[PDB]
Structures are given as C-alpha cells and as structure tokens.
C-alpha cells in the first residue's frame, strides 16, 4: 500500500509561497524558506549550486535603480 | 615504462589546468608600457631621467669582476662629490643611505 493507495491522504501543504523570493519554498513548520533562506538576512547561496546562482541573482530581474547608476 | 628511457619526473599530478598562465597579453604590455613611458617623458620635461645610479660590483666571486648599476649613492659619495643630500633627490640622483 506504499504506492497508489498511500497518496490519497496528501492534502496538507509542507511549503507555501515565500514573501522574499516568491517561490513555494516557505516551510511552514520550520518557519524558513528552503530557496532564498528567509528570515536569515543574507540570501541563501551555495557554490555547489552553480545553476541556482544563475537563476536568481543580479541582472536576472528588472535592475530598476542599478541600470541607471552604472550607465551614469 | 618499456625499453631504455629516463625516469620520468613530471609534476602534473595536481590540477595544472587552473595553474596555467598564458601570455596573450604580452603584445599589449609592450604598448601599455611604452605609452606610459612617453607620457612619463612629458609632464616631467625635460629629464625623465631614471635617476643617476651608482657603479657597483656584482656579488660573489662568480660575478665580482663585472660592474652594474646599483641603487642610490651613499652619503660619503655625495659628500666627496660636493653635493647636498637634500638637493640630490630633486636633480635626478638616486640616494641610498
């Protein structure tokens, strides 16, 4: 019963949306985000996750203020 | 190893690929330094002199019969030549107490 049957009771969310990174990575019982490393002040980044660094970093977004300061 | 050869001593067992330095900037160091030399030639015009250097003997008996440029004249060599040590640095003479 470890296959099809046991999946019927999956109706409680482990993770909800994160306020800082916007991904469904906020662990409710741990009270921290598995993706951006929330309430921790520093954004969670690791050197072994080289792809995770190029998915959310400087220049991957709007760059609302820095696009003007550098060109100036 | 097979047949007659020397015993090989190659230190490539580490990561040499991150230790490789390539000299692709060599043709442009020449341009960068020469241009900086010319701007150095102006600004301090005339006499962009690299300072007068002493005549000193190379160390050790392997080289001691040869002369080469030292760094800076001693205080006695300036006193013997009748040169003030305070003015010497301002007229392009190297000084080494």
């Amino acid at each position: 019963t470890k296959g099809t049957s046991c999946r019927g009771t999956r109706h409680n969310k482990t993770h909800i949306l994160c306020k800082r990174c916007g991904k469904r990575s906020w662990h409710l019982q741990k009270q921290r985000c598995a993706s951006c490393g929330y309430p921790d002040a520093k954004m969670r980044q690791y050197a072994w996750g080289y792809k995770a660094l190029r998915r959310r970093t400087q220049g991957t977004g709007r760059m609302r203020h820095l696009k003007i300061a550098l060109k100036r | 190893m097979k047949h007659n050869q020397a015993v090989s001593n190659i230190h490539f067992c580490k990561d040499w690929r991150s230790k490789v330095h390539t000299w692709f900037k060599q043709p442009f160091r020449k341009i960068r330094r020469h241009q900086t030399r010319v701007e150095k030639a102006k600004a301090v015009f005339p006499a962009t002199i690299k300072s007068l250097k002493p005549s000193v003997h190379c160390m050790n008996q392997r080289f001691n019969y040869k002369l080469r440029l030292g760094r800076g004249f001693t205080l006695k060599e300036l006193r013997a030549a009748k040169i003030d040590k305070n003015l010497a640095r301002t007229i392009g003479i190297a000084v080494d107490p």
Binding site: - | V44, P46, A47, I49, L87, T90, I91, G92
Partner: protein, 122 residues
C-alpha cells in the same frame, strides 16, 4: 494631448489647483463613457486628458521643488532630497582638501626642496 505647457505656466497656484480638479472630473466621466459603449472620439479624448493631468502635475511639482531648492540653498541643514546627487561611496570619501593635507614638517620640505626642472647634456 492638448494643454499647451506655455498655458500651464501662465496660471497661478490657485488656478493650477482648480484646473487639476476640472481635469480629474472630466477623466472620471470619460471612464464612465468607455464602459457604457462610448464613441471612439470619447475614448481617444480620454487618452488626451490622461496626459494633461500628468503634464499639469509635472509643472506643479517641478515649480514647487525649484522653490524649495532656493529656500534651502544657503541653509546649514539641507534635506537629503536637495543634496547633490552622489553615490553612497562618494559621500564616504575624504574631501580633496583632506586627501592632500600635509603636516607642518612635510609642508615646508616641499616648499624649500621642490622637484627642480633640469636636463642632462649628451
């Protein structure tokens, strides 16, 4: 858009205040007309009035902040909005006077023994 900046500059503050209410009220009616099957002429007018409000608010705010810069021009404590545009690093660097400051002993040495101009004959 049809508001003629030259005409905006000719109004006083009170006249410029009332014009914004008139423009805002007109834009509210045109928004109602758009959802009640308004004509294309009314919809094209609605885009014009949108820019007049932006144009009017630009002159109102620019004229106001230019008067505040004059007010605080000689003030000792100037609001951080009116201070010269700089990077955060720039506000931390030493003043050029403070960078080339020299001690009393070093000041006179550079005064009595400056780098002389010379050349060597060859």
């Amino acid at each position: 858009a049809s508001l003629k900046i030259s005409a905006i500059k000719a109004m006083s503050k009170n006249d410029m205040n009332a014009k914004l209410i008139e423009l805002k009220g007109e834009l509210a009616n045109l928004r109602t007309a758009k959802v009640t099957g308004g004509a294309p002429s009314k919809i094209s007018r609605l885009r014009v009035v949108k820019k007049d409000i932006a144009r009017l608010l630009t002159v109102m705010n620019t004229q106001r902040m230019e008067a505040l810069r004059k007010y605080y021009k000689q003030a000792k404590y100037v609001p951080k909005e009116l201070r010269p545009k700089t990077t955060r690093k720039e506000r931390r660097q030493l003043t050029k006077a403070q960078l080339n400051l020299k001690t009393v002993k070093a000041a006179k040495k550079a005064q009595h023994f400056p780098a002389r101009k010379f050349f060597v004959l060859a």
